[PDB]
Amino acid sequence: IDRLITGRLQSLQTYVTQQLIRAAEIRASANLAATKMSECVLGQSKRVD
Amino acid sequence: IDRLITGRLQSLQTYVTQQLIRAAEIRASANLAATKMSECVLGQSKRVD
Amino acid sequence: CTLKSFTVEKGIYQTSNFRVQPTESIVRFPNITNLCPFDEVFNATRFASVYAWNRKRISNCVADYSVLYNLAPFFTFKCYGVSPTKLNDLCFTNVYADSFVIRGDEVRQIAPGQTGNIADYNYKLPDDFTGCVIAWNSNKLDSKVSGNYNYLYRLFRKSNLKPFERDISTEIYQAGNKPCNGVAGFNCYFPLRSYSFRPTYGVGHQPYRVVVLSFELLHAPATVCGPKKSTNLVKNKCVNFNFNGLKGTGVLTESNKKFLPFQQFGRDIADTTDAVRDPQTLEILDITPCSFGGVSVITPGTNTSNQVAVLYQGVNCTEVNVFQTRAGCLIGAEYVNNSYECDIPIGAGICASYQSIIAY
Amino acid sequence: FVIRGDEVRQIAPGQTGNIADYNYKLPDDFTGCVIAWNSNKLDSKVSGNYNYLYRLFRKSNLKPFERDISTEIYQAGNKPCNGVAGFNCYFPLRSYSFR
Amino acid sequence: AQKFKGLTVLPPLLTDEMIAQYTSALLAGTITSGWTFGAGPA
Amino acid sequence: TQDLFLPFFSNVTWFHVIKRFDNPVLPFNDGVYFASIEKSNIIRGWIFGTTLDSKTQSLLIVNNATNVVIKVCEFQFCNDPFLDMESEFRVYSSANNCTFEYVSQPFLNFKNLREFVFKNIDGYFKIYSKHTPIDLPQGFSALEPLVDLPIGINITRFQTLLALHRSGWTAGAAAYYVGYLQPRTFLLKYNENGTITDAVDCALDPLSETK
Amino acid sequence: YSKHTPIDLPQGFSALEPLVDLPIGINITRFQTLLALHRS
Amino acid sequence: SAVQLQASGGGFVQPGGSLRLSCAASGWAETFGHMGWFRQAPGKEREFVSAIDWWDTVHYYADSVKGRFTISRDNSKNTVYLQMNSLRAEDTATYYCAYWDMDYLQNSIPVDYWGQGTQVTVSS
Amino acid sequence: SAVQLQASGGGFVQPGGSLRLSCAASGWAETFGHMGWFRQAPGKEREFVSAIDWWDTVHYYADSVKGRFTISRDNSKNTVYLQMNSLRAEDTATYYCAYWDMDYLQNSIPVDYWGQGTQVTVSS
Amino acid sequence: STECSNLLLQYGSFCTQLKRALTGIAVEQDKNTQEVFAQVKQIYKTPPI
Ligand SMILES: *[C@@H]1O[C@H](CO)[C@@H](O)[C@H](O)[C@H]1NC(C)=O
Ligand SMILES: *[C@@H]1O[C@H](CO)[C@@H](O)[C@H](O)[C@H]1NC(C)=O
Ligand SMILES: *[C@@H]1O[C@H](CO)[C@@H](O)[C@H](O)[C@H]1NC(C)=O
Ligand SMILES: *[C@@H]1O[C@H](CO)[C@@H](O)[C@H](O)[C@H]1NC(C)=O
Ligand SMILES: *[C@@H]1O[C@H](CO)[C@@H](O)[C@H](O)[C@H]1NC(C)=O
Ligand SMILES: *[C@@H]1O[C@H](CO)[C@@H](O)[C@H](O)[C@H]1NC(C)=O
Ligand SMILES: *[C@@H]1O[C@H](CO)[C@@H](O)[C@H](O)[C@H]1NC(C)=O
Incomplete structure (x- = not known):
């Protein structure tokens, strides 16, 4: 049993x-998703791609 | 003992x-902390939030 | 107890399981056991001669040992190598029964290492014989007032009978040099002799029925084993049960849609026995283990208050200010149709706070 | 205590039998030692030794390390024995034949 | 499925109705108020 | 599960009875798959044994028009043990020693097929059977256990029985095929009713291995 | 086991220490207490 | 072995009288063990009285009771009988029916079973 | 455990005869186990001949010596004895008495102790 | 069976470790969604037109 x-x-x-x-x-x-939501949605980002 | x-x-x-x-x-x-120190301190950041 | 501390701060806690559920053990076994024909040898009224003893083979049956205890007011029974009590539980793949009638004075000759007229001319018992011997008086049924002469025993033979040998030759024994040629006379006596069984005669001359039992162990599946006792059957309420060795605990309902008649058990995705068919009634009844434990407790910090509320995980609120949630069943807290900020998460958008204890 | 040769095999945790049910029972967690030696020269006589007795019948098994000295007549049937031997009425303890 | 052999599958705190509400609110904010609502009053 | 099975797409030996009367000796190996496409019901019983003589005890199974009888009795097999309406029974000439006896109910273009599988292991003669009405068929059919026998000998050979009709004499055009069993791994697809619906071999082709 | 403290049941707490071990083994079920009565 | 012994007879008699005692054996045993009677007095030990075999072949009586006590075995009902004659005062005691399970009784020492005490009193 | 085995017997004999061997054990062991004899032919391997339990209840014999060799036990000396007859030429070998210290015997592979070799020679 | 828990109890305190790890995972999982979504504390509504 042991x-x-x-x-x-x-x-x-x-x-x-x-x-x-x-x-x-x-x-x-x-x-990563939270960062994308905060940047790409709540504003406009000039980061490429 | 084994x-x-x-x-x-x-x-x-x-x-x-x-x-x-x-x-x-x-x-x-x-x-992440190093990136924040590099950007939000030694300069101005346009990334939202 | 679970947190190993005397103070617990605010928040939900997944406590361990405690308390004791004793239950009890039961055992079942197949309905009816095929009895071996013991009475077909003992309860039979008529017996063969000692020199022509009856030999019977027993196979494919159960051997109950309770009837033999009630066989005669006083019978002498003895086994060589096996104790009386521990004979029931043994399993044998063959057993042979030899039965005959003998004189009471010569019964002791039926034993290994014994000599005499019977032990050398009627039946020889091997020295290393394992098995049993039973003997009991039969003067009531094997004797008549007119001197019954039906039974007979051998008297003369050229050689001593071998163990497990049967001699029934009726040729005239030649006691001299001159041949007999089938004519009785001098130096030519009949090897067969018959006792004089009479009720008035002494117990030494009174007939005794003797049966020997020999255990034969061939390399084959066993066929002679003791009967299996079946206990009762507790149902419905969660109890422990043991079917044919396998365990189970809990409720008993149907799991049958097209259960194959020859099938016996039924396993879930865990390859664990869930459905079992009772040998009696052959109905089907599953397990569903009971004794669930591990409730959750929502409470503010003890430093503040002492009230608690309980949350049973994934249990309907009728199987135990009672509230019902999607996650489970909540007891001890009252539902409020208002809305607030979440303080202690519960699940499915329900949060509890201490204002008493409220959930919203 | 004195015992009947074979029996020695019973004095051990988890063993069953008369001695290991009505006379002397060992716990499953027992620790210690057991010494056993034949004494046919002393405890057995050709003149018959019958001062050694062992209990045969008891209603229930004993707890580990238990002693029973009650000598009441055993009841094996529904009828009471009233302290008298007879059918279903046997003396609980037998004797030990040493020769 | 639901073979409760000592293993639980807890439900998430945020039901999909609340998540849909959050997404709808974000869409309304980003449609009727540009991006100012993410940095103060809308 | 891994166990004894008949490999898929294997060569099964065919014996046709018609002026053809074929009752040869077939080795037993480990297990036997015995199939018969049946018309007019001329195949009666099975014969098993090791030496196939009056020397060593054998196993006898018969299925007449009345019932099925299973005996363990030493027999005497002649050159052509068969049957001859079937009232003339010329199969065995003697029966001396018997060990086990049992009796049970009878088991019974292309219209009939009788399928059996015999496995002698651990001193048990397990017999599984199947009876499905209609060359060899092409369709999945689960095969169900029928009986277990505690015999415990060592079968190494077997025969077959026939019931030739006497007219000249013509034999019915029934057919029987024999295949052997090997240990391999299969995958079985149970269904809601606990029935074997499909099964894939795990050693036939790479696609099967991947499955 | 035993304990002793000077003074319905007292609303308090006090552990108990092992006093005596009896190395016997008998059947023990329902008991009863004893008493002492001063002479009068 | 499981032997049950039943004793019949006894009571109060006068010196010089006659009496009949009996013992019956039931159950099963190892062999045709012999049957005997012992006698125990109040304050004294048990005393060998009589011994007979299972076929009425060997008779054994104590020296102090040689030629006086008699023992017999029946032919059809298995019950042993003890015929007593010309009693005296020393015969007032409790008799017991003793069984020994072996074929040959070298001595009366090996005893496996006993019998119910039968009180026999001899007085004026 | 500390068990010492003393062997006795052996010598030169005629074919078909009988001879004498006996083994005594002394010391203290874990339990009352089995005891057997082991045969070593010259130039061959060491094989068992038989095995007897301590209480003389069950006996085990090799197929090559069944019905020809037997082993029994003392009742007042704690020494195992064995008898043989019909000795043949192959019996000339070295015999050793061995003690197996477990209650129930399963196979002869694990042997605890060995005794001094007793060489027996049979010839014409 | 209950007596298996008797050996479990003396076998050590692994159970506490596993339970703590599997609860930390659960709370982190629950926090991830709230972090990625609950970024606006007002609930706006689209105009009907
Ligand atoms: C056993 O006999 C039949 C067959 O299982 C069953 O219907 C019946 O209830 C059982 N009765 C007994 C004798 O236990
Ligand atoms: C918590 O403990 C401190 C220390 O005694 C006490 O002063 C304070 O009131 C307590 N607060 C709560 C949460 O009740
Ligand atoms: C709980 O049980 C009641 C009756 O006992 C039933 O009406 C109700 O539907 C159950 N709840 C769920 C979620 O099934
Ligand atoms: C919810 O609670 C409020 C009181 O706070 C009450 O007015 C209302 O009727 C309740 N609604 C339901 C559906 O119970
Ligand atoms: C039957 O077989 C036994 C041995 O298997 C043999 O001794 C006997 O002669 C046989 N009898 C017949 C009729 O074949
Ligand atoms: C069975 O028979 C075969 C061939 O005669 C033999 O090789 C084998 O050892 C036998 N097996 C048994 C179980 O006796
Ligand atoms: C105590 O006595 C009861 C009967 O009164 C008995 O069943 C039980 O086994 C005994 N237990 C002990 C402590 O020996």
Whole structure:
């Protein structure tokens, strides 16, 4: 039963780490989107492309 | 004692990975702060908000 | 308790699960067990001769051991190598029963390492024989007032009978140099002799019915095992149950749309047993584990007040100032049709604040 | 205590049997030691030894490290025994034959 | 789907009605008031 | 799941009975897929064994017009064990030692097809069957278990039975095919009713591997 | 276990320390208390 | 082994009289174990009285009661009988029906089961 | 655990005869386990011959010596005994008594202790 | 089963770590949308014409 606990907990921790990395990436994308909304919508920007 | 050794090793790895992720996030925040210091202080910025 | 502190500040908290649900254990097993024909050998009224003993094979049935206890007012029973009590639980892939009638004085000759007329000319028991021997008086049914002579035993033989051997030859035994040639006389005696079973005779001469049981272990699926006891069946209310070994806990309803008749279990996406068919009634009843725990608690900081409100996650508000939200069920707070700024998020655009506790 | 050869296998956590149900039960978390040695020379006589007794019948199993010395007549049926042996009325403890 | 094996899927705080309201307000501001509403009174 | 199965698009051996009377010996290997396109119902029973003689015990399965009978009895097989309206039964000459007996209900252009798969493993003679009315058909059909038998011997060979009609004599134009089983991995598509609707092989072609 | 403090139940708090261990093992169910009556 | 023993007889008699005791055995055992009777006095130990086999072949009586007590086995109802004659005062005690489960009784020491006490009093 | 095995018996014999071997154990072990004998032919590998539980309940014998070798136990000396007959030429080998320290025997691969080699030679 | 929780309790305090991480992810996810959208504190309405 200890081996079963170890295996299941290891799988859980792996999934948690994957979720953490994906959430960090999504947060970076959300920050970029917020910048675009604040600049390209609420005004006119001369930044190229 | 091998089981204790392995358990403590996993306890170390969890902390190391968490610290790495937090360090990456703080690095991103520091880069943003550096950009803000360079632009909004040493000059005038026309970017909205 | 969950936060490991004596003061908790304002905000929602996902507390852990506590309390105890004891429940109880039940076990089921297939309805009806095919009994082995024990009475077809014992309860049968007539028996064969000792030199022509009956040998019967038993297979593909369950062997109940309760009837044998009620067989005679006093019967002598003994197994070689196996204790009496622990015989029921064993599993055997073959068993053989030999039955006959013998004289009471010569019953002890039916044992490994024993000698005598029977042990050498009628039936020899091997020294390393594992199995059982049962014997009981039969003077009531194997004796008549006119001296019944039906049963017979061998008296003369050229060689001692081997273990597990059957000799039924009726040829005249030659006791001298001159041949018999099928003529009775001097040096030529009939090997077959018959006792004199009479009610007035002594217990030593009174007939005794003897049955030996031999366990044969071939490399094949077993066929002789003890009966399986089936307990009751608690339903509806969440209880623990054990079907054929597999576990379950909780309510019992139908999961059948086109459940195949031969199918027994049913698994979800987790490859975990959810649907199980009861061996009795063969109806279908799923599990749906109960004992849900892990409610959420919304509260202001203790430094301020002490009131709390509970939020059950994704549970209808009739399965437990009660309020219903899309996220779950909220208890302890009153809904206000007004609007304010969000203070403690809950979900689906509902926020709670302490003015008592209100949610909007 | 004195025991019948084979039995030794019962004195161990999680074991069952008469001695391990009505006479002496070990907890599952037991720690310690067990010493067992034959004593046929002393505890057994050709003249018959019957001062060693063991309980055979009890309504319920014992908790770990429990002792029972009650000598009431065992009840095996619905009718009371009234302290008298008979059908469904057997003395709870048997004797030990050592030869 | 909804195989509640100890795993929850919490709902977002902001329902899509509120998000649609926010986008509509932003559109109205950017149509009827240029870009001044992003830096003070509209 | 990975288990014993018949590989897709495999060569199944065909035996035609018509002045053709083919009852040869076919090795058992591991498992057997036995199919028969049936007209006039001339194929009666199955014969199994290892030495196919009066030497070693064999398995007997018959399905007459009345019921099905399963016996474990040593028989004596002649050159042409078959049947001859079918009242003349010339298949075996003796029956000496019997171990297991059982009796059950009878199992019964192109109009009929009887499909069976036999798997002898772990000392169990598992038999799965299928009966679907109508050369070889082209259509997916789930095959359902029918019986398990605790026999525990070691079948290494088998035969087939026939019921020739005597007129001159003409044999009905029924057909039977035999295929072997191999261990491989399949993917099965269950449906709402818990029925096998489709199945893909995982070792046939690269497209199958990708699927 | 035991405790002792000088003075309905008192609205307070006080932990209890382990006093005595009895290394016996018997059946123990419903009990009853004892009393002392001064002579008169 | 599971043997149940039932004792019948006893009571109050006079010296020099006659009496009949009996024991019946039910259940199952290892073999045809022999049957005997013992006698215990108030304040004293049990005393061997009589022993008979399961087929009426071996008779064993104590030296102090040699030729006086008699034991017999029935032929059709399994009940052993103990015929008593010419009683004296020393016979006032409690008799017990003792069973031993083996084929040959070297000594009366190995006892597996006992019987219900039957009070036999001999007095004027 | 600390177990010492003392072996006795062996010598030169005629084919088809009988001889004498016995092994005694001393010291202290974890539990009351099995005890067996191991045969080593010259130039061959060491193979088991049989195995007997301590309480003489169940016996295990090799297929090559079944019905020809037997093993029993003492009742007052704690020494295992074994008897054999119909000895053939292949029986000339070295025998060792071994103690298996577990309650239930599964296979003969794991052997705890070994005794001094007892060489037996049979010939004409 | 309840007795498995008995070994879980002595196995350590990993559960707290995983729960804390998976709640931090949730609150960050909820804050991202509000940051990217709620940038105007007034709700304007388009004229009917
Ligand atoms: C068992 O017999 C039938 C078959 O399962 C079932 O209908 C019946 O209710 C059961 N009754 C008993 C004897 O338990
Ligand atoms: C919080 O604690 C301080 C310290 O006692 C107290 O003075 C203050 O009133 C408290 N405030 C709240 C939130 O009730
Ligand atoms: C909750 O249960 C009631 C009846 O018990 C039912 O009317 C209601 O629709 C349920 N709520 C939901 C969201 O299904
Ligand atoms: C909402 O609450 C207000 C009071 O604040 C009340 O006047 C109104 O009728 C309520 N509406 C509904 C739908 O309950
Ligand atoms: C049947 O088979 C047994 C052995 O398998 C053999 O001894 C016997 O002679 C056979 N009898 C017949 C009639 O084939
Ligand atoms: C079964 O028969 C085959 C061929 O006769 C033989 O090789 C195999 O060992 C046998 N298996 C069993 C289970 O006896
Ligand atoms: C205490 O006695 C009860 C019966 O009164 C019995 O069932 C139980 O097992 C006993 N427990 C102990 C502490 O021995």
